[PDB]
Amino acid sequence: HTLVWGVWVNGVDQGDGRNIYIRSPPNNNPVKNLTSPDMTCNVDNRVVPKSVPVNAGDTLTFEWYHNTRDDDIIASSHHGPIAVYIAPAASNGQGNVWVKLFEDAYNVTNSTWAVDRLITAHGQHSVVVPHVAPGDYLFRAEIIALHEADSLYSQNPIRGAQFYISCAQITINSSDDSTPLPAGVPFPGAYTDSTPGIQFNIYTTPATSYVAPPPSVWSGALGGSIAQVGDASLE
Ligand SMILES: O[C@@H]1[C@@H](O)[C@H](O[C@@H]2CO[C@@H](O[C@@H]3CO[C@@H](O)[C@H](O)[C@H]3O)[C@H](O)[C@H]2O)OC[C@H]1O
Ligand SMILES: O[C@@H]1[C@@H](O)[C@H](O[C@@H]2CO[C@@H](O[C@@H]3CO[C@@H](O)[C@H](O)[C@H]3O)[C@H](O)[C@H]2O)OC[C@H]1O
Ligand SMILES: O[C@@H]1[C@@H](O)[C@H](O[C@@H]2CO[C@@H](O[C@@H]3CO[C@H](O)[C@H](O)[C@H]3O)[C@H](O)[C@H]2O)OC[C@H]1O
Ligand SMILES: *[C@@H]1O[C@H](CO)[C@@H](O)[C@H](O)[C@H]1NC(C)=O
Ligand SMILES: O[C@@H]1[C@@H](O)[C@H](O)OC[C@H]1O
Ligand SMILES: [Cl-]
Ligand SMILES: [Cl-]
Ligand SMILES: [Cl-]
Ligand SMILES: [Cl-]
Ligand SMILES: [Cl-]
Ligand SMILES: [Cu+2]
C-alpha cells in the first residue's frame, strides 16, 4: 500500500504533486485485475492541471510514501520489482504505447528486492529522461508486490500480484530527439496470467530465479537507480 507524493528533477523537489501533476488515485489500494483499465494509470485516470518541465538527460525521481511523506514507504512484506514506463500524453495511455525505461527486480549481491531498497531510499527511485521528441509525456511508475503472487487474481480474487501504479505528467522541453520513442506495449494487455514474473512464489523459489515481466528495457533508455536524491525532511 503506497502512493507517489511528487517528483524531484536533478535533485530538486518539485513539490506536492498529488492531483496536480500526478494522476493520483483516492487511496493506496493495489490494482490486481490485469485486464482492467485501472492497469493504465490506476483508478482515477484523468488529466490533472500541471505537467513537470524537464529536459532530456535530467534525473527524474519518483517519491513514494505509505500514509504520510517519508514514512515507512511500503510494508516490508511487499517484496517485488519496480519498473518505469513512458508514453506520449496524446495517447492517454491507450494502445501499444508504453516503453520501458527501467527495471529492477532482485539484487543478488545485496540479497534485496527492489522494494526493499526503495524503503531504504526513503521512497525514491529515478530514471534519466531519454532523448525523445520534445512534448508531453506520461511516466508510469509501477511497483509489483509479490507476497500473494503464488495465486492468480483471476482465479482467487483475494490473492494475486499487487500493482501500485502512478502516472506523472512530464513535459520534455529541450531534447535533440536522438532516440525517437518507439512502439510500446499496452496496459492493460502486456501482463497476462502466463506472463513471466506475474505468478511466482517468493517464499520457496529462490529470488535469483525470478524473471520480471517483459517487455525488456528499451535500448534508448539512459538508466536509473533506487536511491535517495533528496531529504524530504528539509522543507
Ligand atoms: O512463512 C511463510 C508464510 O508467511 C507464507 O505466507 C504468506 C505470508 O504473507 C501473507 O500476506 C500478508 C497479507 O497481509 C499483509 O498485511 C501482510 O503484510 C502480508 O504479509 C500471505 O498472504 C501469505 O501467503 O507462506 C510461506 C511460508 O514460508
Ligand atoms: O490481498 C489482500 C491483502 O492485501 C489484505 O491485507 C491487508 C491490506 O490492507 C492493509 O491495511 C492497509 C495498510 O496501509 C494503510 O495505509 C491502508 O489504509 C490499509 O488499508 C492490512 O494491514 C492488510 O492486512 O488482506 C486481505 C487480502 O485479500
Ligand atoms: O473483489 C473483486 C471486486 O473488487 C471487483 O469489483 C470491482 C470494483 O471496482 C469497479 O470499478 C469501479 C466502477 O465505478 C467507477 O468507475 C469506479 O471508479 C471504479 O473503481 C470494477 O469495475 C469492479 O470490477 O469485482 C470482482 C470481485 O472479485
Ligand atoms: C477485470 O476487469 C475487467 C475489465 O473492466 C472486468 O470486466 C472484469 O469483471 C474484472 N474482473 C474481476 C475479477 O474483477
Ligand atoms: O473498473 C472501472 C471500469 O469498469 C471502467 O469502465 O473504467 C474505469 C475502471 O476504474
Ligand atoms: Cl503527506
Ligand atoms: Cl539510498
Ligand atoms: Cl538533448
Ligand atoms: Cl514460483
Ligand atoms: Cl539515476
Ligand atoms: Cu499493501
CATH number, position 174: 2.70.50.70
Beta strand 3-9 pairing with 99-104: unpaired
Does the N-terminal peptide bond of residue 81 adopt cis geometry, omega within 30 degrees of 0?
Answer: no
Considering only CA atoms, give the Rg of the chain.
Answer: 16
Domain ranges, residue 225: 2-235
Of ligand 5's atoms, which has the minimum distance to the CA of residue 43? 10
Resolution of the entry in angstroms = 1.5
Q: Where are the beta strands (DSSP E) in the chain?
A: 3-9, 12-13, 52-54, 59-65, 82-88, 99-104, 106-107, 112-113, 124-128, 135-145, 162-172, 224-226
Method: X-ray
CA of 37 to the centre of ligand 3 (A): 11
User: Which residues are annotated binding-site positions for Cu(2+)?
Assistant: 1, 78, 164
Q: Where are the beta strands (DSSP E) in 146-191?
A: 162-172
Q: State how far Cα 36 lies from the chain centre.
A: 17
159 lines ligand 3 (CB under 6 A): no
Determine the longest span between alpha carbons in the chain, in angstroms.
Answer: 48
Q: Which protein residue's CA is at the shortest distance from atom 9 of ligand 4?
A: 36
Q: Which protein residue's CA is at the shortest distance from atom 18 of ligand 1?
A: 77
* φ, ψ at 41 (rounded to 5°): -145, 35
CA of 30 to the centre of ligand 11 (A): 7
Alpha-carbon span 111 to 63, nearest angstrom: 23
Between the CA of residue 21 and those of 8, 14, 121, 166, 211, what are the distances in Å? 12, 10, 22, 11, 32
CA of 62 to the centre of ligand 10 (A): 11
36 lines ligand 5 (CB under 6 A): yes
User: How many domains are there within the chain?
Assistant: 1
The set of cell numbers assigned to 96 is: 501499444
28 lines ligand 2 (CB under 6 A): yes
Could you tell me which residues come within 8 angstroms of residue 62 by beta carbon, excluding any fewer than 6 positions away? 4, 7, 84, 123, 124, 125, 126, 139, 141, 166, 168
148 lines ligand 2 (CB under 6 A): yes
User: Which residues are annotated binding-site positions for O2?
Assistant: 147, 162
CA of 175 to the centre of ligand 2 (A): 42
